[PDB]
């Protein structure tokens, strides 16, 4: 008793390590935005063709009341209706002392009850994110009073310091993940709009322009591929990939690229930047605590026949006598995105849970398989294309080349290749050749 910041490139390891899925969440929301704008434009076009024939079935003649409804009803904006702050504060109780919800779900897109498209809700995937349970614990919060962070000497969930928080500051502390995903949404909205505008099949205008110069049937201009610092194709991550470029003679000609390969990582590091304050306040001596000394008094009241049970306590004392932040447990990994769901109801006769979609389409799948070819390629770039990328730290990643570089999934795979201006912070396999694996 008397004496015995965050590197932009280092965050790539933080994207996924089997314990964090912020990159997976970003991929999910990006693909979701492709889903909203694409589905919007296809319904818009189909509806225009339907009312342009308002003398013949189905909008004319003797429509079924469902087709009548579709003909009458306009098509709203799904991007506008989707936000996460309002869904979060709907989910959490307004009372600030009760236990907060552990997780939050957000089906994408988002319609309310009066909206007659409620069944389309969730057609474009779903995102999930948990609460920051460090503050969900009992912290003596008050509806209108003042709250104090647990310091040293009590059962605390935050660091060993005490800070004063009012009602407004605390509820805004609850919206950390809310405006987090919100800024993801706003920052990928422009990318999604550009991507949906880049596809000729989505150009509802009957354009008779240069059809021989388009990069592919699904994009006039390629997005581009990672390029090494010297300026050649960065096919494998093993060689450093820094810049963005095109590919010559892709389909007989080369077209301009609209991106830098830094929009995706851009979203991620804005995410990390806005989270930095929140986790910073959660972490707020740290190398010493008074609790380590209190056990002595009971040890006196206690006896010597239990001395051994304080052994690791004693090591906690004599040793002290001789003596880049990333979010973990965010929950965006738990989200899901299935591209096949737009073509699910179609068949001999169309089935639940989106039969009525197929009934407006009169059981055609062309407009929706165009969406699938946008998302991952099939079949406009072959019967088989790129798959869901592995967003975990994979130093053996292979960037997709050629026309398949001009799909959403392949673009994501290529973007998670490049290296931000910061010094590299991803360690490849030390001996990959030492475990070779020869199968074809």
């Amino acid at each position: 008793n008397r004496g015995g910041q965050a590197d932009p490139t280092k965050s790539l390891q933080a994207a996924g390590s089997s314990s964090s899925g912020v990159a997976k969440g970003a991929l999910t929301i990006l693909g979701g935005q492709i889903c909203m704008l694409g589905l919007q434009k296809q319904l818009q076009a189909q509806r225009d063709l339907y009312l342009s024939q308002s003398k013949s079935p189905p909008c004319g003649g003797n429509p079924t009341p469902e087709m009548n409804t579709f003909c009458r009803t306009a098509i709203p904006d799904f991007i506008s209706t989707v936000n996460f702050v309002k869904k979060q504060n709907d989910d959490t109780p307004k009372d600030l002392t009760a236990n907060q919800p552990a997780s939050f779900e957000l089906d994408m897109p988002n319609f309310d009850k009066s909206s007659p498209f409620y069944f389309l809700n969730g057609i474009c995937g779903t995102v999930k994110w948990n609460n920051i349970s460090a503050l969900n614990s009992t912290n003596q919060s008050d509806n209108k009073g003042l709250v104090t962070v647990g310091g040293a000497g009590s059962n605390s969930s935050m660091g060993a310091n005490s800070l004063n928080i009012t009602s407004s500051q605390l509820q805004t502390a609850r919206l950390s993940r809310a405006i987090a995903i919100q800024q993801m949404y706003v920052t990928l909205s422009t990318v999604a709009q550009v991507m949906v505008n880049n596809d000729p099949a989505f150009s509802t205008t009957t354009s008779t322009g240069n059809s021989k110069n388009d990069f592919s049937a699904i994009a006039k201009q390629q997005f581009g591929v990672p390029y090494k610092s010297s300026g050649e194709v960065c096919t494998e991550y093993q060689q450093v990939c820094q810049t963005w470029g095109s590919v010559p003679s892709s389909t007989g000609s080369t077209t301009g690229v609209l991106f830098n390969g830094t929009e995706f990582l851009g979203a991620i590091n804005d995410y990390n930047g806005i989270m930095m304050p929140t986790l910073n306040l959660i972490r707020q001596s740290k190398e010493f605590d008074k609790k380590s000394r209190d056990f002595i008094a009971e040890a006196n009241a206690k006896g010597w026949i239990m001395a051994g049970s304080y052994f690791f306590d004693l090591v906690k004392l004599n040793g002290s006598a001789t003596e880049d932040q990333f979010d973990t447990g965010t929950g965006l990994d738990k989200s899901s995105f299935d591209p096949t769901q737009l073509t699910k109801p179609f068949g001999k006769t169309c089935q639940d849970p989106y039969s009525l979609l197929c009934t407006w389409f009169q059981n055609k799948s062309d407009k929706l398989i165009q969406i699938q070819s946008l998302i991952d390629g099939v079949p406009a770039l072959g019967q088989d294309g790129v798959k869901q990328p592995d967003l975990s730290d994979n130093p053996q990643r292979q960037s997709v080349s050629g026309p398949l570089s001009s799909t959403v999934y392949g673009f994501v795979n290529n973007s998670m290749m490049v290296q931000l201006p910061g010094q590299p912070g991803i360690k490849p396999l030390t001996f990959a050749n030492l475990i070779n694996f020869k199968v074809d």
């Binding site: 021989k212 810049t243 963005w244 077209t255 301009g256 830098n260």
Partner: peptide
Amino acid sequence: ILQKQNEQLAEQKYQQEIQQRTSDML
């Protein structure tokens, strides 16, 4: 850095406008 790369993309851009105007001229 970012400025450097989009300047380079702009520099590479200013070669294909001539050929597309050429095709329109065909």
